[PDB]
Structure 1
Amino acid sequence: HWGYGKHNGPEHWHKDFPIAKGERQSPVDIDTHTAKYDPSLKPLSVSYDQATSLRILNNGHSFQVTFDDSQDKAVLKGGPLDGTYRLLQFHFHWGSLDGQGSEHTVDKKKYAAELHLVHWNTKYGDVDKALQQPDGLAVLGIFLKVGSAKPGLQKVVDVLDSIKTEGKSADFTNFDPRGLLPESLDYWTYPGSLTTPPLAEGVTWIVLKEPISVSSEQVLKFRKLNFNGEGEPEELMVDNWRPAQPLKNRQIKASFK
Structure 2
Amino acid sequence: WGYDDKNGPEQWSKLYPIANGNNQSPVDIKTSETKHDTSLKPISVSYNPATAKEIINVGHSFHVNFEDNDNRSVLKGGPFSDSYRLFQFHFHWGSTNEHGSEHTVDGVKYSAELHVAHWNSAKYSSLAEAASKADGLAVIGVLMKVGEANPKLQKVLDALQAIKTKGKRAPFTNFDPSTLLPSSLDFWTYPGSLTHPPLYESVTWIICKESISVSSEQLAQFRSLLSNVEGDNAVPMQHNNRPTQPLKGRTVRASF
Same fold (TM over 0.5): yes
TM-score band by shorter chain is over 0.9
Does 1:23 pair with 2:22?
yes
Q: Distance in 1 between matches of 2:178 and 2:27?
A: 26
* Equivalent residues in 2 for 1:211-230, closer than 5 Å: 211-230=211-230
| Contact residue 153 and residue 179 of structure 1 kept, 8 A | no
| Contact residue 56 and residue 169 of structure 1 kept, 8 A | yes
- The AA in structure 2 aligned to 1:106 is V
Aligned equivalent of 2:139: 139
Going from structure 1 to structure 2, the CA distance change for 1:151 and 1:159 (only over 3 Å counts) comes to same
Does 1:150 pair with 2:161?
no
SS in 2 for 1:124: coil
SS in 2 for 1:174: coil
Q: Distance in 1 between matches of 2:164 and 2:114?
A: 19
- The AA in structure 2 aligned to 1:116 is H
* Equivalent residues in 2 for 1:39-58, closer than 5 Å: 39-50=38-49, 52-58=51-57
- The AA in structure 1 aligned to 2:26 is P
- The AA in structure 2 aligned to 1:65 is V
Does 1:172 pair with 2:167?
no
* Equivalent residues in 2 for 1:35-74, closer than 5 Å: 35-50=34-49, 52-74=51-73
- Give how far 1:255 is off: 0.4
SS in 1 for 2:191: strand
Of residues 46-55 and 71-80 in structure 1, the stretch that sits farther from structure 2 once superposed is 46-55
SS in 2 for 1:12: helix
Structure 2 gap segments, 5+ residues each: none
Aligned equivalent of 1:111: 110
TM-score for both structures, normalised by structure 2: 0.97
Of residues 42-51 and 22-31 in structure 1, the stretch that sits farther from structure 2 once superposed is 42-51
- Give how far 1:214 is off: 1.6
- Give how far 1:231 is off: 2.4
Q: Distance in 2 between matches of 1:49 and 1:164?
A: 27
Q: CA RMSD in A?
A: 1.1
Aligned equivalent of 2:90: 91
Q: Distance in 2 between matches of 1:87 and 1:170?
A: 19
Does 1:12 pair with 2:3?
no
Q: Distance in 2 between matches of 1:99 and 1:239?
A: 12
Structure 1 gap segments, 5+ residues each: none
Of residues 225-234 and 104-113 in structure 1, the stretch that sits farther from structure 2 once superposed is 225-234
Going from structure 1 to structure 2, the CA distance change for 1:170 and 1:50 (only over 3 Å counts) comes to closer
- Give how far 1:99 is off: 1.1
- Give how far 1:217 is off: 2.3
Post-superposition CA distance 1:10-32 (Å, at most 9, x none): 01111111111111000000001
Q: Distance in 1 between matches of 2:187 and 2:131?
A: 23
- Give how far 1:102 is off: 0.5
- The AA in structure 2 aligned to 1:129 is E
- The AA in structure 1 aligned to 2:137 is L
Q: Distance in 2 between matches of 1:135 and 1:171?
A: 30
| Contact residue 51 and residue 74 of structure 1 kept, 8 A | no
Post-superposition CA distance 1:106-151 (Å, at most 9, x none): 1111110001011000011111110121000000001111222222
Aligned equivalent of 1:81: 80
| Contact residue 24 and residue 191 of structure 1 kept, 8 A | yes
- Give how far 1:216 is off: 2.3
Question: Equivalent pairs: percent with the same residue?
Answer: 61
Q: Distance in 1 between matches of 2:102 and 2:65?
A: 21
| Contact residue 50 and residue 73 of structure 1 kept, 8 A | no
SS in 2 for 1:161: helix
SS in 2 for 1:141: strand
Q: Distance in 1 between matches of 2:135 and 2:50?
A: 23
- Give how far 1:232 is off: 2.6
* Equivalent residues in 2 for 1:178-197, closer than 5 Å: 178-197=178-197
Aligned equivalent of 2:235: 235
| Contact residue 56 and residue 169 of structure 2 kept, 8 A | yes
- Give how far 1:81 is off: 1.3
